[PDB]
Structures are given as structure tokens and as C-alpha cells.
Amino acid sequence: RPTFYRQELNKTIWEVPERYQNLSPVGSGAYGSVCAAFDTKTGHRVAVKKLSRPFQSIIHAKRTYRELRLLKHMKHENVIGLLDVFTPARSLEEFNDVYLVTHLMGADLNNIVKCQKLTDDHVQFLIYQILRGLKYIHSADIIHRDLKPSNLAVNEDCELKILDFGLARHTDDEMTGYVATRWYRAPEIMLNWMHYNQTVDIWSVGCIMAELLTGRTLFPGTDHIDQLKLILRLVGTPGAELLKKISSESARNYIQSLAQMPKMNFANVFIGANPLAVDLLEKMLVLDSDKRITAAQALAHAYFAQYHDPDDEPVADPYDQSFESRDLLIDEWKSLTYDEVISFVPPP
Numbered sequence: 073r074p075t076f077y078r079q080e081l082n083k084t085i086w087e088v089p090e091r092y093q094n095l096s097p098v099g100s101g102a103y104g105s106v107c108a109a110f111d112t113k114t115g116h117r118v119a120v121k122k123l124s125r126p127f128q129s130i131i132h133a134k135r136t137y138r139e140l141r142l143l144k145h146m147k148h149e150n151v152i153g154l155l156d157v158f159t160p161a162r163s164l165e166e167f168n169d170v171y172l173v174t175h176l177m178g179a180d181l182n183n184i185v186k187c188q189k190l191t192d193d194h195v196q197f198l199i200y201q202i203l204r205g206l207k208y209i210h211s212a213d214i215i216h217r218d219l220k221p222s223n224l225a226v227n228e229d230c231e232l233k234i235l236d237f238g239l240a241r242h243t244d245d246e247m248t249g250y251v252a253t254r255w256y257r258a259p260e261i262m263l264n265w266m267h268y269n270q271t272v273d274i275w276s277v278g279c280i281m282a283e284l285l286t287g288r289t290l291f292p293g294t295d296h297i298d299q300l301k302l303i304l305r306l307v308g309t310p311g312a313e314l315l316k317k318i319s320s321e322s323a324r325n326y327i328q329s330l331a332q333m334p335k336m337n338f339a340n341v342f343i344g345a346n347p348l349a350v351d352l353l354e355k356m357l358v359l360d361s362d363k364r365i366t367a368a369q370a371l372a373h374a375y376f377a378q379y380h381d382p383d384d385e386p387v388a389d390p391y392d393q394s395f396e397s398r399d400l401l402i403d404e405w406k407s408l409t410y411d412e413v414i415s416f417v418p419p420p
């Protein structure tokens with residue numbers, strides 16, 4: 073067991089191993105508080121996140137367990153990984169606080185799309201990395217659910233990591249009105265017409281790629297209905313074959329109220345783009361999720377010919393998510409989480 077030291081920074085008690093020095097507050101949300109620190113064991117600058125109220129309800133206790141399991145599993149160059157997890161507790165009986173440690177991130181993709189002149193080669197490399205990371209995540213039957221520019225970390229060498237997985241956190245208020253939180257979502261999930269599946273992440277990559285090519289948001293709707301009208305004007309209205317797949321009677325009656333529109337010519341929308349970029353966008357931005365290109369299929373598209381290496385695009389170890397259908401008490405979720413804290417083995 074390491075030696076811990078205690079201090080108060082910005083109205084919060086931090087109790088951490090001596091290895092973490094020069095702690096400085098960097099933000100806080102509903103989920104926890106974050107400090108930047110220097111890790112003397114590894115030599116890296118790190119983010120230390122102290123969870124808030126991790127075991128306050130059954131919902132909160134299960135969310136805590138879900139996040140720790142997902143971060144412990146992810147071991148890939150283009151996905152955030154877990155450097156450390158700790159608690160100052162000496163036993164299950166006094167266990168209350170959980171701290172998570174990751175590499176400290178600088179710029180996100182928002183910064184570089186707003187401020188930088190991007191070549192076609194930059195767009196090829198950035199979208200290649202997102203798809204390499206997604207091939208890995210989807211091979212474990214994990215859905216990200218919240219891919220958007222603010223959840224993609226980028227450095228000065230254009231190297232990219234996926235972070236901030238959807239832990240089913242977002243609320244109704246958060247998705248309402250003129251908000252970036254909804255602009256990257258597939259239209260069948262934002263109107264709650266289909267159960268989530270891994271094809272929803274490929275719609276989000278289409279929206280991100282369009283915005284790197286034009287420097288503008290593809291579907292900046294003022295509310296759910298405005299956003300659906302922007303989507304259908306570009307890709308056209310649902311065909312009868314797609315209508316057949318919708319369960320809700322009330323969903324079908326609404327779609328059927330709209331005038332029919334054809335799919336637009338994407339070369340006349342993305343004016344001057346690489347023809348191979350236009351072809352890949354037409355394969356991602358498909359209304360019927362069964363017909364969208366997969367991450368593994370996209371990596372072999374001719375747009376990525378200069379980066380594609382089928383011997384260096386790894387898949388994940390198998391991931392057991394059977395806990396998601398399990399009904400437990402707060403103290404049972406808390407015991408499972410304690411075992412995952414004490415069994416953690418750091419990377420090389």
C-alpha cells in the first residue's frame with residue numbers, strides 16, 4: 073500500500089498517493105472533480121478525477137462499476153486507457169471514495185476544426201484513427217454513443233484518442249434546442265425510434281468527417297424536428313422498405329406526413345472535396361442503419377490507401393457485460409467495484 077497525503081483544494085478533500093505531486097484544479101461536473109498532477113512514477117502529466125457520490129443510489133453505484141469496468145478493458149493507441157485507480161480506504165467497511173488517473177489531454181478536435189487550415193491528408197489521417205479505434209471498440213460489442221469533436225483529443229503531431237464514452241449519462245434537458253450534444257446523433261435514436269446499436273457511431277463519424285471537410289456543422293438543428301428536416305433534405309425521405317422496419321405506429325404516421333424528397337448529389341454539397349471522400353460520406357450517411365458501412369469495411373476503402381495496414385488494426389479481448397441485466401443492492405455494486413480497484417494491474 074502506498075503512503076497517502078491529504079489536502080483541501082477549492083472546497084474539496086483530496087487524499088492521494090505521494091507519487092502524484094503539484095495538484096491543480098482543472099474543472100468539475102455532476103460526475104466528479106478533476107486536478108492536473110505530475111506523476112513521479114511514470115514522468116507523465118496526468119488527470120486525477122475524484123468521483124462525486126459514487127454509491128449514493130443503486131443507479132449511481134451501477135454507473136460507478138460500469139465506468140471502472142470499461143476503462144480497465146480499453147488497451148488501444150486510439151482509445152483513452154486507465155493509468156491508475158485508487159482509494160484511501162484500508163477495508164471494504166470504510167470504502168467511500170474512488171479516484172481515476174489518465175494521461176492529461178490538451179487540444180480536442182473542436183480547437184483544430186475552428187482554427188487550423190486542414191489538407192485532405194489531415195482529414196484522411198484523423199478519420200483513419202477514429203475508425204481504427206472504433207474497429208477495436210465494436211469488436212468487444214461496446215457502443216460509444218457520444219462521438220463528437222469535444223470527445224476526441226488531438227496533439228501537435230495530429231495523433232488522436234477517443235474519450236468520454238456514453239455511460240447513459242445525458243438527460244432530456246441536455247438534448248433540447250440549439251445544442252452540439254444532439255448534432256452528431258443518428259435520427260432514429262434522437263427521436264427514440266430504434267434501440268441503440270453500434271451502427272449509430274458510424275453516423276457520428278460521417279457528421280465529424282463532413283465538418284473537417286467544410287469547417288461547418290453538417291446538421292446544426294434548432295430542435296429535434298428542425299434537425300430531422302436538415303437530415304432528410306440531404307439523404308432523402310425513408311423508402312417503403314425502411315418504413316417496414318419501424319415498430320411505432322405513431323412514428324410511421326409522422327414520417328408519412330412529410331413530402332417525399334430524393335437523396336441530394338453529394339459532389340454538389342461538398343464542393344471540391346476528394347471524390348473518394350465524397351464516396352465514403354455517401355456510405356456512412358445512410359438512413360437505414362442496416363445498410364451503413366462498418367468500421368472494419370471503412371478501413372479498407374481507397375480513401376485510406378496511404379495509412380491502411382491490415383496487420384496493425386487490432387481487435388479487442390472479449391468483454392463480458394452480463395452485469396448490465398443484473399439486479400443488485402447498493403452494497404453488492406460497491407463490493408464488486410472494491411474488488412476491481414484492488415485487482416488493477418498498471419500498464420508496462
Ligand SMILES: NC(=O)c1ccccc1Nc1ccc(Cl)cc1
Pocket residue numbers: 259260265266310314317318319327359360361362
Ligand atoms: N433500420 C433502421 O435504421 C431503423 C429501425 C427501426 C426504427 C427506425 C430506423 N431508422 C430510421 C427510420 C426513420 C428515419 Cl427518418 C430515420 C431512420
Ligand SMILES: [Cl-]
Pocket residue numbers: 074075089090091092
Ligand atoms: Cl506513492
Ligand SMILES: [Cl-]
Pocket residue numbers: 151152153154175233
Ligand atoms: Cl491513453
Ligand SMILES: [Cl-]
Pocket residue numbers: 159160161166167168169170
Ligand atoms: Cl474511501
Ligand SMILES: [Cl-]
Pocket residue numbers: 182220221222223252
Ligand atoms: Cl463537440
Ligand SMILES: [Cl-]
Pocket residue numbers: 390391392393
Ligand atoms: Cl470481460
Ligand SMILES: [Mg+2]
Pocket residue numbers: 222223236
Ligand atoms: Mg466530453
